[PDB]
């Protein structure tokens, strides 16, 4: 059997940001979907590839497990075929994606009284990324008329820290999102 280490993702107590999502390739282990039931109350447990009831009966050669924390309104953009600031510059899924997206509320775990600034998202960029590709470039973004190459006039950094505090609205509260990608 040797069940897959799902506890290391859903119960890591140290999550990666959306621009550096912790890609974990699931292989050589039986996908035990029982721990997914206990690790979350299933806020946005919605699949697009296969039905959840027959998850344990299928067979896959390559399975991916991503993880990233975003605001509440940005979870609806993790579905295949969306456009925004997270579905374009931080994360991308193909149109024929076969998997499930697990999102739940972590306002009591990722929100600090003085503000949890460890979560940043890329707001603006020139072009949009490719599915399952990362962008950890810290080079400042150019938006002005002349090449600035400091953050001078109309030149800003692409990242931006999340407004996560326990008093923020549930739309802006930290929502930990997990994606179980499958390949046939």
């Amino acid at each position, epitope marked *: 059997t040797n069940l897959c280490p799902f506890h290391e993702v859903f119960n890591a107590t140290t999550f990666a940001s959306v621009y550096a999502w912790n890609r974990k390739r699931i292989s050589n282990c039986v996908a035990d979907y029982s721990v997914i039931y206990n690790f979350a109350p299933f806020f946005a447990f919605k699949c697009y590839g296969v039905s959840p009831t027959k998850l344990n009966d299928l067979c896959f050669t390559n399975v991916y497990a991503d993880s990233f924390v975003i605001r509440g309104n940005e979870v609806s953009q993790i579905a295949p075929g969306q456009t925004g600031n997270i579905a374009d510059y931080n994360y991308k899924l193909p149109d024929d994606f076969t998997g499930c997206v697990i999102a*739940w*509320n972590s*306002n009591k775990l990722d929100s600090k009284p003085s503000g949890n600034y460890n979560y940043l998202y890329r707001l603006l960029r020139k072009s949009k990324l490719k599915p399952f590709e990362r962008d950890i470039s810290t080079e400042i973004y150019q938006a002005g008329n002349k090449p600035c190459n400091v953050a001078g006039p109309n030149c800003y950094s692409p990242l931006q820290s999340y407004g996560f*505090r326990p*008093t923020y609205g*549930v*739309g802006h509260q930290p929502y930990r999102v997990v994606v179980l990608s499958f390949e046939l």
Partner: antibody
Amino acid sequence: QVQLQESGPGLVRPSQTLSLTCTVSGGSVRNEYYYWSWIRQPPGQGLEWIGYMHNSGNTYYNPSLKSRVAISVDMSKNQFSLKLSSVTVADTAVYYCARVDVGGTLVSTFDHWGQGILVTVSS
Amino acid sequence: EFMLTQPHSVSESPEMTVTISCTGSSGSIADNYVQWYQQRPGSAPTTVIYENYQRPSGVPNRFSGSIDSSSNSASLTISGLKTEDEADYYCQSYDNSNVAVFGGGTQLTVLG
């Protein structure tokens, strides 16, 4: 409009627990962007916040009434209850249930209140 | 630890203006919202001011709120008082640890 109503025994004994229920008529406990709260008020004193809870399970309590309160929700009948254990004679008060707005980018006003229920913890 | 301290009693004759206040002893008062609730004796509280400036539907224009971050306090300005305005006005806000902090309570009494 949305309205709330408290219900429970109007007389308790020490070393026991106080259990009240707040049936939500006109709304839905399933609705997010809202915290379901319980408020306390001793006779002749000011309001005292007991705690609220999000329908997803995020429970926030008063730092003084911790380890003695327990608020839960029931999606079946659109109700949420209060469980205040280890009651003493000083817990005689009028108990209110209210909901708070958590949609406008921050936690906000207690938009809808109940009607008030008086309990007398006596021995 | 975040507190709100209101005056114990405020009283002005009709057609005058009262200013119920509340000072945040700890924390800050601009970092969260400040709401004001009116509780008549024998009834439930009622929102009169939310988002620190706005009045809910049905609330008359005689009420108005304000926030001063220099002194770390809030206020509830009421003008043109009438016989139905005398009630207990509470100053409610939040701590950054997500704790609803109510004020001690100000019993407004319109003199007759």
